[PDB]
């Protein structure tokens, strides 16, 4: 979800309703966890670029003073804006930052590549995956770990040729990304290493989380797009 | 009638849902926006902030240098409203786009985030 107001939140499909189509050149999420392939897909017609973090961002947030001339430049390059964010959190007492820039026009080709991998896979196959082989990128309170590195998940399920196609599409979609060696998670008061990093997370369905999968299937557009 | 500002190169809206524990940081972030939003840096564009704090109603702000000082100008004081309602967000965007037309628009979405997860995800775990 995004945006807390009292008890009320915007679910990702509600956020898409709040945004006009084809108006914004970019959306910058100053928020945790929004560089999610599902979220970028849901919002693909709301911006040409989405600049966001796949993990948690320190509460100090983005360095708006330094970003400002870059945000208003004639030659707007959001990779520069993301670099300003990243470089801020370097040799810092909390040197923990992840960022990616997604070019939304390339998401349809990416969707097709993923569909050709996932649509014929069974849930038992997905549930069987060894989590130690995939980079976990989310440690929300009470979570057993739901969001993993997108590349690592797909790598467990693709043939060599399918994987090569996926990487070609992924590199066209994620046009800039950066990460510090570790990412800090508030619900564990620790930073953990990032061993593998593509810039986006994905849901890894788990047998123990059937209610989560049910909600995902009905409310997150990416599910029907690539699993069916 | 309200007369729109002269069209420009870019309008950026920062939509700050800070009716939560991030309150103090929204204010520090607005400070940093003020430091950066000089006439030279805004390059002719508009910086608009929808600020929804805890404890008081939302406000629409324009950040703009006038007479050598970057000002945080109150445009609108809203009544209490649900800033997480998509129709409220759309309405605010519409106010902004209408009054500050541009060749390019950007949006900063500022708040807590949890990816696609349902906001009641804790109820869907056990």
């Amino acid at each position: 979800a995004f945006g807390q107001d009292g008890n009320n939140w915007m679910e990702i499909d509600d956020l898409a309703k709040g945004l006009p189509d084809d108006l914004f050149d970019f959306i910058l999420f100053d928020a945790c966890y929004m560089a999610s392939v599902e979220c970028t897909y849901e919002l693909r017609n709301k911006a040409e670029y989405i600049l966001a973090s796949p993990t948690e961002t320190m509460a100090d947030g983005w360095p708006y003073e330094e970003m400002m001339p870059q945000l208003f430049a004639t030659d707007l390059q959001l990779e520069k804006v993301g670099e300003t964010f990243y470089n801020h959190y370097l040799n810092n007492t909390y040197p923990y930052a992840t960022v990616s820039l997604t070019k939304t026009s390339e998401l349809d080709n990416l969707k097709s590549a993923i569909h050709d991998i996932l649509a014929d896979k069974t849930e038992s196959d997905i549930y069987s995956l060894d989590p130690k082989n995939m980079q976990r990128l989310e440690y929300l309170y009470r979570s057993p770990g739901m969001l993993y590195d997108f590349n690592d998940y797909i790598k467990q399920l693709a043939t060599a040729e399918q994987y090569d196609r996926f990487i070609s599409c992924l590199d066209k979609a994620v046009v800039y990304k950066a990460h510090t060696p570790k990412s800090y998670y508030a619900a564990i008061g620790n930073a953990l290493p990032i061993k593998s990093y593509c810039g986006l997370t994905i849901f890894v369905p788990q047998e123990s989380l059937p209610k989560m999968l049910e909600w995902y299937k009905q409310r997150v557009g990416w599910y029907k797009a690539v699993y069916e | 009638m309200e007369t729109p500002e002269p069209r420009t190169t870019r309008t950026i809206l920062v939509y700050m849902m800070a009716n939560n524990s991030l309150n103090s940081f929204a204010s520090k972030n607005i400070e940093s926006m003020i430091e950066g939003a000089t006439s030279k840096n805004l390059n002719g564009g508009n910086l608009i902030v929808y600020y929804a704090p805890a404890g008081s109603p939302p406000e629409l702000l324009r950040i703009k240098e006038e007479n050598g000082v970057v000002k945080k100008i109150h445009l609108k004081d809203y009544e209490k409203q649900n800033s997480a309602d998509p129709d409220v967000m759309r309405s605010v965007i519409g106010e902004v786009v209408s009054q500050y037309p541009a060749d390019s628009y950007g949006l900063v979405l500022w708040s807590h985030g949890t990816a696609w997860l349902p906001s009641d995800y804790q109820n869907k775990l056990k």
Binding site: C32, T57, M58, A59, Y184, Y185, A186 | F25, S111
Partner: peptide, 4 residues
């Protein structure tokens, strides 16, 4: 320290 807080995160977002």
């Amino acid at each position: 320290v807080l995160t977002x």
